[PDB]
Curated annotation (Swiss-Prot):
It comes from the Viruses. Responsible for the cleavages located at the N-terminus of the replicase polyprotein. Participates together with nsp4 in the assembly of virally-induced cytoplasmic double-membrane vesicles necessary for viral replication. Antagonizes innate immune induction of type I interferon by blocking the phosphorylation, dimerization and subsequent nuclear translocation of host IRF3. Also prevents host NF-kappa-B signaling. In addition, PL-PRO possesses a deubiquitinating/deISGylating activity and processes both 'Lys-48'- and 'Lys-63'-linked polyubiquitin chains from cellular substrates. This is Papain-like protease nsp3. Inhibited in vitro by GRL-0617. It is a multi-pass membrane protein. The chain holds residues 1025 to 1191 of 7096 of the full protein. May form homohexamers. Interacts with N protein. It catalyses: Thiol-dependent hydrolysis of ester, thioester, amide, peptide and isopeptide bonds formed by the C-terminal Gly of ubiquitin (a 76-residue protein attached to proteins as an intracellular targeting signal). The gene is rep. It is found in: Host endoplasmic reticulum membrane. Residues 1-167 form the Macro domain.
């Protein structure tokens, strides 16, 4: 049993809810929250800007030190950093940004990072301002992630479309 409430079960391991990932993290304090990161860990907007704002910019301060030491992530890659006030850990995952021309095939590689964690609270990778089709992102998630993933979908309209079109 775990703390996640109000989710619709899509598969053995994938659950979905209409919710702002920030408010969900604040309530649940999951072991792992996933950030929709870029390779520079510049948390300006979208999910990343919202998570970072909720940490009072502590996520950005920690991320800048990580990049100064290690250099940029790979598209499809990840790093584990603090979850600050939102979670034990934040798994920063870089999905391909369609609005930058990145290979959508890298979306599967991005979701593979989730398999290193038994349970996660996450957004749909490469959705929102990253430009991918969220229906596609959900299909890749279900076909790639084998650990237990609780997906928070910000837009109520999109949530209803994801559920009603799910195969
Ligand atoms: O007002 C805020 O602090 C952020 C609101 C918000 N919540 C989000 C969740 C996901 C993506 C962008 C988001 N923007």
């Amino acid at each position: 049993v775990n703390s996640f409430s109000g989710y619709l079960k899509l598969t053995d391991n994938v659950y979905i809810k209409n919710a702002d990932i920030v408010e969900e993290a604040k309530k649940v304090k999951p072991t792992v929250v996933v950030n929709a990161a870029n390779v520079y860990l510049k948390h300006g907007g979208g999910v990343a800007g919202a998570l970072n704002k909720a940490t009072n910019n502590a996520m950005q301060v920690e991320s800048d030190d990580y990049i100064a030491t290690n250099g940029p992530l790979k598209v499809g890659g990840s790093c584990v950093l603090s979850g600050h006030n939102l979670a034990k850990h934040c798994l920063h995952v870089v999905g391909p940004n369609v609005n930058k021309g990145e290979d959508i095939q890298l979306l599967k590689s991005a979701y593979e990072n989730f398999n290193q964690h038994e349970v996660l609270l996450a957004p749909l990778l490469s959705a929102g301002i990253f430009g991918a089709d969220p229906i596609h992102s959900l299909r890749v998630c279900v076909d790639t992630v084998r650990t237990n993933v609780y997906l928070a979908v910000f837009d109520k309209n999109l949530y209803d479309k994801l559920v009603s079109s799910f195969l």
